[PDB]
Write an enzyme that holds these catalytic residues in place. Sequence first.
Site, PDB file in Angstrom:
ATOM      1  N   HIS A  87       1.292  14.921   6.588  1.00  0.00           N
ATOM      2  CA  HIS A  87       0.679  15.867   7.544  1.00  0.00           C
ATOM      3  C   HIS A  87       1.549  16.957   7.451  1.00  0.00           C
ATOM      4  O   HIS A  87       1.130  18.268   8.121  1.00  0.00           O
ATOM      5  CB  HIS A  87       0.234  15.752   8.922  1.00  0.00           C
ATOM      6  CG  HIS A  87      -0.802  14.998   9.324  1.00  0.00           C
ATOM      7  ND1 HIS A  87      -0.936  14.443  10.286  1.00  0.00           N
ATOM      8  CD2 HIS A  87      -1.769  13.936   8.220  1.00  0.00           C
ATOM      9  CE1 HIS A  87      -2.122  13.669  10.221  1.00  0.00           C
ATOM     10  NE2 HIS A  87      -2.678  13.607   9.098  1.00  0.00           N
ATOM     11  N   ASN A 141      -5.143  17.016  12.439  1.00  0.00           N
ATOM     12  CA  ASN A 141      -5.141  16.362  10.909  1.00  0.00           C
ATOM     13  C   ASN A 141      -5.240  17.688  10.457  1.00  0.00           C
ATOM     14  O   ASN A 141      -6.434  18.312  10.560  1.00  0.00           O
ATOM     15  CB  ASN A 141      -5.616  15.311  10.892  1.00  0.00           C
ATOM     16  CG  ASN A 141      -6.018  14.150  11.779  1.00  0.00           C
ATOM     17  OD1 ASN A 141      -6.386  15.017  13.128  1.00  0.00           O
ATOM     18  ND2 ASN A 141      -5.710  12.702  11.614  1.00  0.00           N
TER      19      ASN A 141
HETATM   20  C1  LIG Z   1      -2.892   9.065   2.782  1.00  0.00           C
HETATM   21  C2  LIG Z   1      -3.818   9.091   4.051  1.00  0.00           C
HETATM   22  C3  LIG Z   1      -4.162  10.492   4.205  1.00  0.00           C
HETATM   23  C4  LIG Z   1      -4.651  10.538   4.864  1.00  0.00           C
HETATM   24  C5  LIG Z   1      -4.941  10.004   5.441  1.00  0.00           C
HETATM   25  C6  LIG Z   1      -4.346   8.613   5.672  1.00  0.00           C
HETATM   26  C7  LIG Z   1      -3.590   7.781   4.875  1.00  0.00           C
HETATM   27  C8  LIG Z   1      -3.661   6.849   4.765  1.00  0.00           C
HETATM   28  N1  LIG Z   1      -5.917  10.813   6.861  1.00  0.00           N
HETATM   29  C9  LIG Z   1      -6.012  11.995   6.781  1.00  0.00           C
HETATM   30  C10 LIG Z   1      -6.941  12.113   7.939  1.00  0.00           C
HETATM   31  O1  LIG Z   1      -7.296  11.560   8.425  1.00  0.00           O
HETATM   32  N2  LIG Z   1      -6.992  13.613   8.375  1.00  0.00           N
HETATM   33  C11 LIG Z   1      -6.148  14.038   7.230  1.00  0.00           C
HETATM   34  O2  LIG Z   1      -6.686  15.881   7.727  1.00  0.00           O
HETATM   35  N3  LIG Z   1      -5.841  14.082   6.710  1.00  0.00           N
HETATM   36  C12 LIG Z   1      -5.605  12.846   6.067  1.00  0.00           C
HETATM   37  N4  LIG Z   1      -4.750  12.435   5.282  1.00  0.00           N
HETATM   38  C13 LIG Z   1      -3.999  13.675   4.570  1.00  0.00           C
HETATM   39  C14 LIG Z   1      -5.054  13.965   3.108  1.00  0.00           C
HETATM   40  O3  LIG Z   1      -5.296  12.835   2.445  1.00  0.00           O
HETATM   41  C15 LIG Z   1      -4.734  14.764   1.882  1.00  0.00           C
HETATM   42  O4  LIG Z   1      -4.120  16.393   3.279  1.00  0.00           O
HETATM   43  C16 LIG Z   1      -5.246  15.719   1.620  1.00  0.00           C
HETATM   44  O5  LIG Z   1      -5.961  15.039   0.472  1.00  0.00           O
HETATM   45  C17 LIG Z   1      -4.295  17.102   0.690  1.00  0.00           C
HETATM   46  O6  LIG Z   1      -5.405  17.316  -0.253  1.00  0.00           O
HETATM   47  P1  LIG Z   1      -5.193  18.105  -1.369  1.00  0.00           P
HETATM   48  O7  LIG Z   1      -6.205  18.440  -1.989  1.00  0.00           O
HETATM   49  O8  LIG Z   1      -4.318  19.575  -1.130  1.00  0.00           O
HETATM   50  O9  LIG Z   1      -3.759  17.013  -1.990  1.00  0.00           O
HETATM   51  P2  LIG Z   1      -3.850  15.721  -3.088  1.00  0.00           P
HETATM   52  O10 LIG Z   1      -5.279  15.630  -1.945  1.00  0.00           O
HETATM   53  O11 LIG Z   1      -2.411  15.047  -2.288  1.00  0.00           O
HETATM   54  O12 LIG Z   1      -4.143  15.896  -3.715  1.00  0.00           O
HETATM   55  C18 LIG Z   1      -3.418  16.714  -5.144  1.00  0.00           C
HETATM   56  C19 LIG Z   1      -3.620  15.678  -6.442  1.00  0.00           C
HETATM   57  O13 LIG Z   1      -2.609  17.583  -7.677  1.00  0.00           O
HETATM   58  C20 LIG Z   1      -2.651  16.040  -8.070  1.00  0.00           C
HETATM   59  N5  LIG Z   1      -1.261  16.014  -9.293  1.00  0.00           N
HETATM   60  C21 LIG Z   1       0.132  16.759  -8.566  1.00  0.00           C
HETATM   61  N6  LIG Z   1       0.945  17.290  -9.295  1.00  0.00           N
HETATM   62  C22 LIG Z   1       0.260  17.483 -10.419  1.00  0.00           C
HETATM   63  C23 LIG Z   1       0.771  18.046 -11.373  1.00  0.00           C
HETATM   64  N7  LIG Z   1       2.065  18.696 -11.517  1.00  0.00           N
HETATM   65  N8  LIG Z   1       0.201  18.139 -12.531  1.00  0.00           N
HETATM   66  C24 LIG Z   1      -1.198  18.435 -12.282  1.00  0.00           C
HETATM   67  N9  LIG Z   1      -1.941  17.397 -11.062  1.00  0.00           N
HETATM   68  C25 LIG Z   1      -1.068  17.505 -10.413  1.00  0.00           C
HETATM   69  C26 LIG Z   1      -2.614  14.172  -8.073  1.00  0.00           C
HETATM   70  O14 LIG Z   1      -2.406  13.395  -9.489  1.00  0.00           O
HETATM   71  C27 LIG Z   1      -3.827  14.988  -7.256  1.00  0.00           C
HETATM   72  O15 LIG Z   1      -4.699  13.662  -6.949  1.00  0.00           O
END
Ligand SMILES: *Cc1cc2c(cc1C)nc1c(=O)[nH]c(=O)nc-1n2C[C@H](O)[C@H](O)[C@H](O)COP(=O)(O)OP(=O)(O)OC[C@H]1O[C@@H](n2cnc3c(N)ncnc32)[C@H](O)[C@@H]1O
Lengths: 576, 576, 52, 104
Positions: free
Chosen positions: B506, B551
Amino acid sequence: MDIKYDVVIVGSGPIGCTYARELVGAGYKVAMFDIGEIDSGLKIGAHKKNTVEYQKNIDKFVNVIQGQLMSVSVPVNTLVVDTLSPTSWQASTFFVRNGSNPEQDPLRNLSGQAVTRVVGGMSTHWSCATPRFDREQRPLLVKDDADADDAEWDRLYTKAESYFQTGTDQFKESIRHNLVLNKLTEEYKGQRDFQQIPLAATRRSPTFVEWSSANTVFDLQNRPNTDAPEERFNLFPAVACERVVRNALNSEIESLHIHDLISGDRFEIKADVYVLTAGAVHNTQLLVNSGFGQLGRPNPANPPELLPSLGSYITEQSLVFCQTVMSTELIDSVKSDMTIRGTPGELTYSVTYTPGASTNKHPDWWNEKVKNHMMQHQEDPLPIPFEDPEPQVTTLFQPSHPWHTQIHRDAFSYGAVQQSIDSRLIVDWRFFGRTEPKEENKLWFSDKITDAYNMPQPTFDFRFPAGRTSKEAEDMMTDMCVMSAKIGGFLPGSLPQFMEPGLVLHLGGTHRMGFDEKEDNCCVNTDSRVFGFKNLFLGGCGNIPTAYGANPTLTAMSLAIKSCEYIKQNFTPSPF
Amino acid sequence: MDIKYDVVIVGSGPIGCTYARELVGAGYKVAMFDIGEIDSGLKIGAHKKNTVEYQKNIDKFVNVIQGQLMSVSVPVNTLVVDTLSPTSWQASTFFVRNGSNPEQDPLRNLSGQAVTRVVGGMSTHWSCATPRFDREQRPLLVKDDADADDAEWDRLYTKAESYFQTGTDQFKESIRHNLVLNKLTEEYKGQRDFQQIPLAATRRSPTFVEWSSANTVFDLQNRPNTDAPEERFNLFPAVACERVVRNALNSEIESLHIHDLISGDRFEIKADVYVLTAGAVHNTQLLVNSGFGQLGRPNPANPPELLPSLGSYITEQSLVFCQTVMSTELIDSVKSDMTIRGTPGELTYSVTYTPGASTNKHPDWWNEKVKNHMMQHQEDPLPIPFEDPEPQVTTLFQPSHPWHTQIHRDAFSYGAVQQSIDSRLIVDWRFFGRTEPKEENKLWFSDKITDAYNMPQPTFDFRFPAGRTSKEAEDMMTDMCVMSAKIGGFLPGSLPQFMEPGLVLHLGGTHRMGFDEKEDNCCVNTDSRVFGFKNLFLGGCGNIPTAYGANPTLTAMSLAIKSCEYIKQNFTPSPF
Amino acid sequence: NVIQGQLMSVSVPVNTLVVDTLSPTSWQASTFFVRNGSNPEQDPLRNLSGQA
Amino acid sequence: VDWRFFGRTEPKEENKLWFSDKITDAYNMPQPTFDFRFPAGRTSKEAEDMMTDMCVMSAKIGGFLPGSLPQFMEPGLVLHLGGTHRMGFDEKEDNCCVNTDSRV
Ligand SMILES: *Cc1cc2c(cc1C)nc1c(=O)[nH]c(=O)nc-1n2C[C@H](O)[C@H](O)[C@H](O)COP(=O)(O)OP(=O)(O)OC[C@H]1O[C@@H](n2cnc3c(N)ncnc32)[C@H](O)[C@@H]1O
Ligand SMILES: *Cc1cc2c(cc1C)nc1c(=O)[nH]c(=O)nc-1n2C[C@H](O)[C@H](O)[C@H](O)COP(=O)(O)OP(=O)(O)OC[C@H]1O[C@@H](n2cnc3c(N)ncnc32)[C@H](O)[C@@H]1O
């Protein structure tokens, strides 16, 4: 959904995909059902490890594999938990909890046996080794003419090799691979011959390999489509196929009963030809749920009406496993052809070699890689480059060493979780024994307990046979200790061990092939047709009736090819 | 691959999908890039739990999660392996192996922090909990008018809950939900309020829940397409975004440098508008890789030219966890309304209840399910139906209990349940604390160590601040210990503990929001626009600048909705 | 260590751990038989397993 | 710092130490067997409340040591076994084996 097809196939593993590729190819109107779902990406039933992300963090793929391996029979748990708070609810018996099977004798299980329910089955995660069996491991397709038998197997395997894109070249420029290969080759002095493991894979770049899978055999897209305007195929995922209905004389199948897991609805699908390719366990479950064999705990007293050999004579390979850490002597030999001056990390340090020199132990491409690694990364104490592909070495099964070998690195449901020893030094050792088929080794189905899809719960009664099976398994363990020592010492934490019975997932013989139902104690003929029934075919490792050590899928594919020949010879596809 | 778009979004997680749904809908020519790939099924970016086989085998999903959490910063390993064979290559120092980061102090890490690189990002695996922040946790969007600030946040959250399909009733007819809900409501009556966890999820049947994901926000299909003939959107997976190109004046972004991971080729992509939604870690990486903040180990003797607060004031929550075994008293109350005659197994066993009776402790729907279970499974010693949905209870953050709580069951990378205690009895407790933002807590990037994608390696310098943050974390642990005890004793093997720092995932503050760059030590304004730059926007948890326990995703989505409202007003879509 | 060295358990139930990775050549049990001083009278779920 | 909290257990008839008439120990004497559970009711409620007290009190001094999280110990490891040949004034009325001079 049509209610009527030319052919229906249960299961979209690599063996169902062989039947689809052959028969959709030949103009048949084909439907395929899978209890599992398309997850895998836009290539339907493709190999889950064909992502950049996985091949850059390969250790994480072990988890993906555990995530989709669902144990076949778990005995009732008798662990004692006597430190619950006195206020917590506390059991008085070891009662049936968490999906466990009270039929299962814990001491006669294949505890490691598991199944995968997704489109493309286990080919979505498998490690892609596709060797041929030699004569000693191979069922016969012709008797009394070994040359004719050889020619049949060579044609079928050759075709099976095209479908999977099997090759022995994909790892030829790996330093670790050649370092291990050449050393074992030298040490054995023609007594054993080594080569690259035949792998169903195509290399796309130096750091990426497109591993094969179901999708490779058949792309599983619905047809007709612009790419194949005259073909007819539909896949139906999330559909449990529960039984085939026999006619009264037991000479034909009249329908397939299915259950749509999303709507909840049930149907009876009608076809000219019914093919079961749901894996070695689940084929057998589906037949027994259909009135074949015997339901329930085996009972000689009321021997079955049909297929008395179904679920007997099963075989699973013994598997021994370790990991080694490369010997100093081998690591230093990497850099045998180099001239090294000064101290790493100073401007005056250098690393050179003489190109083409006949006395060099290594080729120029190797010395180039070494030089560049050691010049660009002077903080690193190893001469192996950081992204050198893995080793992939085998010496195949031979009568005087009757076990398959893999001396390699790949992802499985076990295998080092460790960080303290550099991964470039680590080589995996997997030796696979052959198991005699014995009548008393059985897969059967409870008449009371059911699995998560409400089908008869599979139960094993299995032990490795005494005599030759057991003698070779221990001799095999010794062989692995002796051999692995030529390359280096065992990695702490991955010491030489037999693995949990059935972990190796090479179960055979559950619906075994032979020439004569009775004389051969078998379930299908050499056309893979169930004895008695004009229009029912089984495909998979469950057909293999022999003791084999080598990885069985390519052999099961070859059988399915032959089966498809008989189907072309006896059923006409409907007009389009 | 056009070379020019109206808008480019880096990142296909839920937050990038918010910019997409808003901007594709408003007629912008939008492109989105993700470093990872479509795997998840034919619904692109959907929740990976939404399979029939996962929801029948829910403990297996833990392996899926483990398989796509790649550690951010792993310090150099100093474990002693002194039992190698004397022939094996042996280290002389603790040199850099296996991806470790030599910049990392292992005592000031967030060693549990990890990233997920796949289409849909972390939303392909999350546990879907979306609560609102109360004022105490939440940044101000309006200065000097608390009631207008609340009005704005209510409007945003309402829209964001619609996008996620948030609800508080999908678990209402769970017996275990209600069993715990009722007991804690009663134990804290007049003191604290309990309800269901607000969950982004839609129940489809009694045994199946459609968990929400980025796919719920936006389906990620390329457009134009039949159901949206006038919209323009293209998704490009397996593209590493590496740099945003600053003009010399630092007033605008001129392009986005990308690396296609399948072809190997690099390109400059042009847009009017640039949105970074790569997650808290990787947005920051990308910016530092583009000249923002300060590359390398922090050196205050050198103020950076741009965004001096980038990667400082980072926050991550303290997370305490245990699991419990339901009390005997509670399990008995489950069947309190039942009339029982004889005992199970015996001829006249009957179990009945009187619907509507005023002496009944439970509703008819509860009793009906218990009656049926007990009558259909007389061998089972518990009254809870086998497929009873999971419990999902919370008491939300307040000043007198300033931590979020979750009293539930769900799949995480940890906390996998064992097999000796019946799962119906087990309840998970997770309490999440809030962390004070402090300038010394930092995410920074090596000027020389690089990660698997050859971008600057992330390094943490982190400790839970002394004072309130620390005192509250410990009070929180005691609260868990006291609250859990009302429901049951600790499950052996899941005793109360602090979880590894960062495993909570988080992470906030890395690119924090505020009104004034200087006075509020931030990087983006309340439109999420980067100070100085006309056309660069950041989305995600990294924008959040407060100490929060609940969260964060829903809050991050709200800020993005606000961000889109600015973009819509200030940039004009290109002609269709 | 000294204490552990002189505390001899009063009643040890029959062991029901499953060891299924023995070599096929090794002697293998068909039952959970009385081994190593275990007490077959003892219900392992109603014990004082730590008494010594 | 070590925290050990010790609870009292109500004496119940059905809680027993008995001896096999077939199985023998290492000294060829009849094998001891237990049949014990913590009594429902006050014993169990007190035990749980006791765990809570330890979690509450200990927290005033410091956090738990990882690897030594609060837990109930394997039954009997405390080695404070009583009442196997219990004292009272009257053998029948007080369900006992010795008087208060400890005479059988
Ligand atoms: C793992 C997890 C997460 C989680 C959860 C339980 C688990 C086991 N429970 C949640 C919950 O119940 N409520 C809550 O609010 N959060 C929960 N989490 C966290 C939640 O999944 C995250 O906060 C949310 O997904 C974040 O959103 P965001 O859109 O900001 O980011 P991401 O999902 O991490 O995706 C970002 C993506 O961008 C990509 N990437 C990264 N770097 C690059 C570069 N350089 N270039 C192009 N793309 C890039 C990724 O591959 C990714 O998919
Ligand atoms: C897990 C795995 C397997 C594997 C391996 C490494 C691992 C970790 N390494 C291999 C290797 O290098 N080479 C070797 O030859 N094989 C290796 N394996 C084993 C291999 O994956 C299997 O032998 C092969 O996949 C068998 O293919 P087949 O097509 O017969 O079976 P399947 O892939 O299991 O697919 C069967 C499917 O049918 C379904 N199903 C099951 N029951 C039903 C019902 N009732 N109704 C409808 N469909 C059903 C499945 O969901 C499945 O997809």
